[PDB]
Amino acid sequence: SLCFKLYAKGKHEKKTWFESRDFCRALGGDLASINNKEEQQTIWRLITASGSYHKLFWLGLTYGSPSEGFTWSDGSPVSYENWAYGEPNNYQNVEYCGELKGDPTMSWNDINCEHLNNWICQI
Numbered sequence: 547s548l549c550f551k552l553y554a555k556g557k558h559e560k561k562t563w564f565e566s567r568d569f570c571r572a573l574g575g576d577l578a579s580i581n582n583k584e585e586q587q588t589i590w591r592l593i594t595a596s597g598s599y600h601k602l603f604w605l606g607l608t609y610g611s612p613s614e615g616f617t618w619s620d621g622s623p624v625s626y627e628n629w630a631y632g633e634p635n636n637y638q639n640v641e642y643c644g645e646l647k648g649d650p651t652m653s654w655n656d657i658n659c660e661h662l663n664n665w666i667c668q669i
């Protein structure tokens with residue numbers, strides 16, 4: 547079993563999706579995968595425990611292909627989904643990575659992978 551770890555930082559420490567993935571892998575883990583409602587509840591509870599409200603976080607979500615759909619960087623299946631209303635929308639055709647809106651709904655949005663965000667590792 548892995549443990550989720552929140553990285554909620556100021557703009558100077560925020561990372562692109564690829565930088566966040568590489569950071570978590572350097573620690574022996576990966577960006578967090580949310581494969582069912584239970585994992586989602588674990589992360590929400592972790593958000594409440596740290597008081598890290600009103601934040602956006604990279605998850606391990608990245609677009610694969612038409613025959614795969616989205617994928618998790620850790621290789622686990624994208625069975626469960628929790629996209630926000632109207633998402634994923636591939637806005638302007640440049641959104642290939644997934645972020646978590648860290649409020650009680652725990653919804654996902656696709657966004658440009660070069661955006662600087664907070665992130666969640668599984669270690």
Ligand SMILES: OC[C@H]1O[C@H](O)[C@@H](O)[C@@H](O)[C@@H]1O
Pocket residue numbers: 633635637641655656657
């Ligand atoms: O900033 C990009 C972001 O803008 C809006 O919130 C929506 O269109 C989202 O779907 C999109 O990902």
Ligand SMILES: [Ca+2]
Pocket residue numbers: 578579580581585622
């Ligand atoms: Ca998982």
Ligand SMILES: [Ca+2]
Pocket residue numbers: 633634635636637641655656657
């Ligand atoms: Ca989007």
